[PDB]
Symmetry: C3
């Protein structure tokens, strides 16, 4: 029988057990770790961990079901190349946000900075939202983002411009916007007499001039409904400009009212930082305090490599002021994409290793926001993955994913161009012991690497904590080829299965749950993206406004009454001009034409008609105007050219002309 001490070879014991029990029996390993020389049938165990040396000298750990309290979710399912949550995730007012980039490749082509959000602690996720448009100068350049977070109720993002041609960095800008919230407040509004401004006391409001604010039950005349911030007095007070003045001071103290903000109705604040010298990518976001934050960065295009952070001490008053700070220079070679987080006055930083045959990922802490560091090397050249993390109690909990199967270990060659099942790990490291020598990387879930192209969307994720769960948001593929090598070298997302990469989220229990289960099985018709309702007439009805930007083929079409108390049906045409034309008929091009009719049918019996004949028509380019009255209003009836065409013809005479004077023949 098995020792389960994590050192004694249990292979043979475990094999005997499996052969001796029925396949349906969940063998309970009692939370112990069993050393093996080959992985057994993991699916037959619960509450079991395995230590296994795929590559001798590099032990890795493997969790059976129920070893950790955890679950994998698939959180996007879109034809875009969906990847790079790195390192933008955050939670705000109970909502979990998973930003990423949806593109058509490793690059900024067709790219939108996007997010999906969860309102239910990760069970269920929202329809993707585009945060950025394509750049004005597309397709020369487009946006890109790997650093996003929240500081004092505003979203802050380092929005980069990069070339489509080489993904070369061109511009860095700090964009920020207030987050949408509802506040239920008591007092705080004052309006002095004989002037129109009211001042609002909202602690750490994070609003700027022109940002949206809406008011309910204020009890101060004029402070009502949709308004904008007129001035900001300080971090806790601002004013709105009302439409009226009164001859007595108002003051809503003691009264319960409501505000009022909106991400979507407030403009971005965009602060151009130019081409920050010596930067390849800005990556990760660490809220420091009420005034500012840090974003990570590295430079890896030319020697020497840099890895560090930019600290923005006061991003509210001075968004363009930041200070660069570098990790110790011995950890900078072969490093990139640092993840940074800030906890009780300590800033933690973990690097990506670029190579399996060089010193890889390292960990650093500072008590002065990067001026001085204490540092530590992860054993065995951890590489190709970022290591996003959170601190829970004394532990840094970090997650990582090899990009393709069997690439994790030191000295493991890249292995692309064939379908595989890359491993995802997490590890705990205690900040007090500050030693990585014995870190245990635990394989908790396996993803798919498609193999159709060299690049992989798997991993390169982001981590947040909400209440007693930690969430690792990361990319994963499926086996559907994008056909880059095939009929889709243009990388059109909307051909066939589009791009295989989508987002997943591993949700792990991190503390006690003192509540009954909130989990449900989803059995609903998903009805947010294209809300469909069967009308009383039994026909599918979509009440949401929508944009179709791809080419549309329609069958029979009815334009219903919709405009001006529904007196009319309306089609409006945009652009410089609109064109309504007629294809060449496939079977009978000799009939080519459009009939315009003021009545319900093709018979002129039903209403006035004008019929435009195609060039292919038997009656080439003929026009027939058919009504019971032809009335020409507001201008003369004239030929385009001079002394070129006539009124009537020998076989089409008008009976006469009713004139107010004799013709002017000239």
């Amino acid at each position: 029988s098995a020792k389960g001490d994590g050192v004694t070879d249990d292979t043979a014991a475990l094999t005997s057990a499996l052969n001796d029990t029925p396949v349906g029996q969940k063998i309970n390993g009692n939370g112990k770790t069993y050393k093996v020389t080959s992985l057994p049938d993991i699916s037959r165990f619960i509450n079991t961990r395995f230590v296994y040396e795929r590559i001798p000298g590099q032990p890795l750990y493997y969790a059976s079901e129920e070893f950790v309290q955890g679950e994998l979710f698939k959180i996007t399912d879109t034809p875009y190349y969906n990847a790079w949550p790195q390192d933008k995730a955050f939670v705000y007012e109970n909502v979990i946000y998973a930003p990423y980039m949806g593109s058509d490749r490793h690059g900024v082509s067709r790219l939108h900075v996007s997010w999906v959000k969860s309102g239910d602690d990760g069970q269920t996720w929202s329809t993707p939202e585009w945060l950025t448009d394509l750049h004005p100068d597309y397709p020369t350049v487009n946006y890109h983002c790997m650093s996003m977070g929240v500081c004092r109720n505003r979203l802050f993002a380092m929005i980069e411009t990069r070339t489509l041609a080489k993904n070369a960095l061109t511009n860095c800008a700090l964009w920020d916007r207030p987050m949408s919230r509802s506040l239920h407040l008591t007092g705080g509004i004052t309006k002095a007499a004989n002037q129109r401004y009211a001042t609002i006391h909202v602690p750490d409001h994070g609003l700027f001039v022109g940002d949206f604010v809406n008011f309910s039950n204020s009890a101060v005349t004029g402070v009502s409904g949709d308004m904008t911030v007129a001035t900001v007095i300080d971090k806790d007070n601002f004013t709105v400009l009302t439409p009226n003045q009164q001859t007595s001071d108002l003051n809503n103290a003691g009264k319960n009212w409501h505000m009022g903000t909106s991400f979507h109705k407030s403009p971005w604040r965009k602060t151009d930082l130019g081409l920050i010298p010596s930067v390849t990518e800005v990556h990760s976001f660490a809220t420091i305090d009420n005034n500012g934050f840090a974003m990570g960065y590295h430079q890896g295009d030319v020697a020497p490599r840099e890895v560090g952070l930019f600290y923005f001490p006061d991003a509210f008053n001075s968004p363009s002021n930041y200070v660069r700070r570098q990790i110790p220079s011995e950890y900078e070679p072969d490093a990139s994409e640092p993840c940074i987080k800030y906890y009780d006055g300590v800033l933690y930083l973990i690097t990506r290793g670029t190579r399996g045959d060089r010193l890889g990922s390292s960990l650093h802490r500072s008590r002065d926001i990067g001026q001085t560091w204490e540092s530590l090397r992860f054993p065995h050249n951890v590489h190709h993955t970022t290591l996003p993390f959170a601190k829970v109690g004394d532990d840094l909990i970090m997650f990582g994913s090899e990009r393709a199967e069997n690439e994790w270990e030191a000295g493991a060659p890249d292995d692309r161009y064939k379908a595989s099942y890359p491993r995802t790990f997490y590890a705990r490291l205690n900040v007090n012991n500050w030693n990585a020598d014995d870190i245990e990387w635990v394989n908790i879930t396996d993803q798919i690497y498609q193999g159709g192209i060299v690049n992989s969307g798997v991993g390169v994720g982001s981590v947040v904590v909400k209440d007693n769960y930690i969430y690792y948001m990361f990319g994963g593929e499926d086996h559907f080829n994008p056909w880059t090598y095939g009929d889709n070298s243009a990388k059109d997302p909307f051909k066939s299965d589009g791009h295989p990469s989508d987002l997943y989220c591993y949700k792990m229990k991190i503390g006690p749950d003192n509540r009954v289960s909130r989990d449900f099985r989803y059995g609903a018709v998903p009805n947010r993206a294209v809300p469909v309702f069967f009308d009383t007439n039994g026909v599918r009805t979509v009440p949401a406004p929508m944009e179709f930007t791809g080419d549309l083929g329609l069958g029979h079409v009815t334009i219903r009454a919709s405009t001006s108390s529904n007196i009319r049906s309306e089609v409006l045409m945009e652009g410089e001009y609109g064109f309504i034309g007629k294809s060449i008929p496939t079977d009978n091009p000799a009939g080519q034409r459009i009939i315009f009719c003021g009545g319900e049918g093709t018979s002129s019996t039903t209403g006035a008609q004008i019929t435009l004949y195609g060039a292919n028509n038997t009656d080439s380019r003929r026009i027939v105007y058919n009504g019971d009255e032809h009335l020409f209003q507001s201008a003369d009836v004239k030929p385009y050219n001079d002394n070129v065409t006539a009124l009537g013809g020998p076989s089409n005479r008008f009976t006469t002309a009713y004139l107010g004077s004799n013709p002017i023949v000239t």
Copy 2:
């Protein structure tokens, strides 16, 4: 070690066990109840119940995973405010129906009485269907319904008319419709000679004159296909009007045939009941027998409050005749929304308590349909929730939900305007012991209350039994703010995340299951709402008819051949008139125009053209008519005004005029 006797404090023993076992180990409580002073990590237990007194003197019970055989499902996911299944659910011919109201708020604004249904015992649910239109007098008033059910194969519903302004009741009507069914029959059709009618024997058909009936393989000439009920002879017999008569008698005795009904092609019968005096809400539905049913009601607008039911003895012959029956007067204060159900000659009624500081929910039974009652009070002022229920064996099984977290208990203050996790409970009550003093409310799932507005959509549900499962259908929110206090005071469902309230269903096993599992994991593309198919050309194709009522923006559009043996493409315009117009160009307003062409391109080479120039065009309001023929048919070519406009001009002369007589100059 823990005693698990439901009285001895097991907190310390349970804590010791938790610390001493691995986190992945499911701790088995052996179906026992453990008293605690704080809830432990419930997620680590299986088959375990906790008794806990959050509020001293008020024990509630808490189920670990697997203590009951039950599972929560989410059954809608719609931007509408989806709530109030109360109390309308029913099962009919294997389909579970979950009616509700989808609106934009606690009120009748934008509201459609709706339902979703399950065809697979609750695993999977249908696209929402609207059962009512917006009221003809919208937006002054609109429909509302909390009472619906099935009697003798017809749906019966109390459709209320209520004002948008104050949700004041305005009108009560009984609407009913036959349910859709397929009948596989033998005999029952007779056709007497020399007349065009046929009589159909169908026991308890429940149809009315004008209702839809379809026939197959009748073997009675003329009784075939789509038809309607011409007269109803009695509950078991009706006639249809065929297109022909025979000179000998017809009688399909001994022959197997099929009928034939439809909810959708039969009109509602609407019986106007007026403004039923002394009624606030009609709520719940209890089928009594083959001829009628009772609906619950309450009056809570003015003293004295009333709580009771309306019995409709014969809803088929006399839909407008009903009798009011009230519960005992002592139970009527602080009570509303009674749930009513009828079993083996006993009518059961459970009230909603309106406040936590007053005697709450009570249960009543009657052997004479509400003339006399036996009554009992639930301990500790059960409030804010309806208590829909079913009788299984000797037990009433009831479900309830607090509307926000920690509101359930007696004396618990309302706690709104902050996000929380409201508890949902069920309880068993033995009808022979008829005593609620020791009722055990068991917390079986937790919901979310969003907190962005005072109102909550959680709970207020409905209950049905199908085979050996009971189902509780009720509302629940998520963390997505509606932004009522924000950019969406107008409460528009299709802005941002719409309204967070949606429907869930708790499915609980209630008797033995003598079959292998029917459960599946859903892995399909949901393809009912907007059925999409990749055509052979690789383009997504929707074959279903559809209505888009919200503003549409389209890109490139082709109108394909579709009408009159596909000889033509067709666009029909509705309303009093149609308008096809041209927006003001953004970049080059001087170009504003629409080109109408009988050919395929902008070049007039491809076909006849009419070009309408906008007022902003360099050639302001010009029209250019361009054809190789301009032929004016059916009427004179005239100026709109008299002696105002000319034919030609000095720089635009017609070569001549071909006339059949000299001009008439006058």
Copy 3:
């Protein structure tokens, strides 16, 4: 206590156990089989099998949860009648294919041969794809397919033509197409001097002249991008015509490059086989080798019945050449739809039994591709189901489904026209033991048969192995009536809930899994079928091109700039002609008209206008042309008829006519 020896009656033991244990306790049967005279509460057991004789003398087995490592998925959800995966499933380059027919009934009406695919080992499935169009002579005949598979990287299908009227077979054709692949290759391309063809060495390419091939990084001038196969030299070599030639030879030996294939951009090869004599249905597919394959068939319309296969020895060079081979004549009566598979030089065939009261399904094997056979009979007249299977180790693993509940057993009468829960079974048979006398059929999942019509979509499935799982793809229904006997005798899929039959897949573990779990919960918005993204303006945006073929009702419509550098908005009309017309208005028909306008509003102020008045208008069939110029280009302005209409009128006089010559009057 229970013996669990599979022969001793354990009913009372088991009953006492259930009575003495809490309902939440999963009772472990330790992989043992328990004989019962009634099925107990299966839901309360884990790792337990039951032997039970519903029909005395006919033992069947019943699996509790966790007895097998297996799970059911639902893989289609479509209003079409989705059924008959029989017997077309296959795996190709890590993708699982589940082809089927989506129709409106048991017949070829509205039918499209279709498939859904899995990219993740069966967790998740794709949007349905149509493989065939409606037949050109629809609705007289249409397509049908029950045999499909892969041989040497081509898809091969027997596409049948059958009448809508009687489902009678009319034509058989072999359709084939190359499968899409990405190949990552080293060397193999040579291009001889002074000619333009590059020959490509790709072993077993399976391509034909005209098939699509795409090249990247070839390092051979001209061999680049999208190309087509010019000639095929042999099975390992083909050429592409390059744009150019060189004076010296080229050979990329040692250079890495990529190809390049496409199912969608390559035409079908269609080989007409005529109406193959004495065939009712071609069914099932067995790849024999690199050159060809076998397809099963049966003839069941006239005596004598035939069951066998058609062997196509070289489908590449001679698609039209096949040889008929039949199973031994004693096994032909009452048999149909053979499933065939080929393993290690042995061809296996299992038949469908057509009735429960005659010798049923039989198994056969041959080492000469059907010339001689060794045969065996399944006990108890197995009938109404095909038995698709795979060989894993020494075992044939087969699956079958009764079509409605309790039809499986010998002598069991069909039981249609009532909703039921039909049993699905699997069985193992060792080919070295070659005796079915003690076959154990294990009920592993229960489906639903709707009952609204006699026909059943359940079962008639298909089986594949991928890695260490076996997959059974089959049909199953739900409780939603199609209303064939009701308001939808026309069987329109898009009314109400359409057709209840859809596809499911049972995924069963068949070998050890040496990896951590790949499973996830699906929490995304399904966004492949109609990809929706909230744009930066907060509106749902669909960027994919789409076709709507069903009648569309639209509200307010804006045609946005789309065409020719987005200078213009564009609507093109197809067919022989386009029609734009105006419905009869409901409220004010006397207003019937369309206003066409070159500007933004209904006021003529905004642009030139032409208004067509309906016949219903007060000004019946009036046209009003309103611009500040009316210019008639390219042609004379003429009346349609000769000397019938005038220019002007007594109350609508032109001021004069500007002419280059006097009127020509006649």
